[PDB]
């Protein structure tokens, strides 16, 4: 049942900064979580795809709890553009209903 | 870019108890997080698929950090068996490398 990884989950603040990444990012895009944490996801995005990815972040926060999916090229550690299909949605605190973070699942396609 | 959901992320203890579920579970399997949290995932598994799912949970902890993927039928709230493809892996504390959670991404096939 052993899988090689094909996706990783990240958490982001509303501006796009990585605040959590699981270790599958090493296999998927070549970076350790430590190399991504504190950086904006848009810094790893192909310049042509940056408005898509920005629009995704803006919209996911406007309709809290709605899921979006976007496709964009991600800069791997090995200096390749990797096509990524990322689903995004906000996670609300169960008690205040405020946005706690944006949850991204980033799949290499 | 709006997506209807057909996967959700859960976290589990080593025995399979749900300790986290995102709200996409409502669309995917019909339950609120509160209906899953504190129950074992095996309680929602078709009896014929229970040993596969047990074997998954046993092995993911043995090779901590390795990703596994299993297919099993999940009992939805609407009393239907839904085929689920679940990837599982343990998330390690960044400083001790001890297991903190099992992270499951549960996708309706």
From Swiss-Prot, chains A, B:
Residue ranges annotated as transmembrane are none
Q: Where is the PAC domain?
A: 69-109
Coiled-coil residues are: none
Which residue numbers delimit the PAS domain?
Answer: 2-64
Q: Where in the cell is it found?
A: Nucleus
Q: What does this protein do?
A: Required for activity of the AHR. Upon ligand binding, AHR translocates into the nucleus, where it heterodimerizes with ARNT and induces transcription by binding to xenobiotic response elements (XRE). Not required for the ligand-binding subunit to translocate from the cytosol to the nucleus after ligand binding. The complex initiates transcription of genes involved in the regulation of a variety of biological processes, including angiogenesis, hematopoiesis, drug and lipid metabolism, cell motility and immune modulation.
Quaternary arrangement and interactors, per the entry?
A: Monomer. Homodimer only upon binding to a DNA. Efficient DNA binding requires dimerization with another bHLH protein. Interacts with TACC3. Interacts with HIF1A, EPAS1, NPAS1 and NPAS3; forms a heterodimer that binds core DNA sequence 5'-TACGTG-3' within the hypoxia response element (HRE) of target gene promoters. Forms a heterodimer with AHRR, as well as with other bHLH proteins. Interacts with NOCA7. Interacts with TACC3.
| Full protein name | Aryl hydrocarbon receptor nuclear translocator
- Gene label: ARNT
Part of the whole protein covered:
357 to 464 of 789
């Amino acid at each position: 049942g052993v899988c090689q990884p094909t996706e990783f989950i990240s958490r982001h603040n509303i501006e796009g900064i990585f605040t959590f990444v699981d270790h599958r990012c090493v296999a998927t895009v070549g970076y350790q979580p430590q190399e991504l944490l504190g950086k904006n996801i848009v810094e790893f995005c192909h310049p042509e795809d940056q408005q898509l990815l920005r629009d995704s972040f803006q919209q996911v926060v406007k309709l809290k709890g709605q899921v979006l999916s976007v496709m964009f090229r991600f800069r791997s550690k090995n200096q390749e553009w990797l096509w990524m299909r990322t689903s995004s949605f906000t996670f609300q605190n169960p008690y205040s209903d405020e946005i706690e973070y944006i949850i991204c699942t980033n799949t290499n396609v």
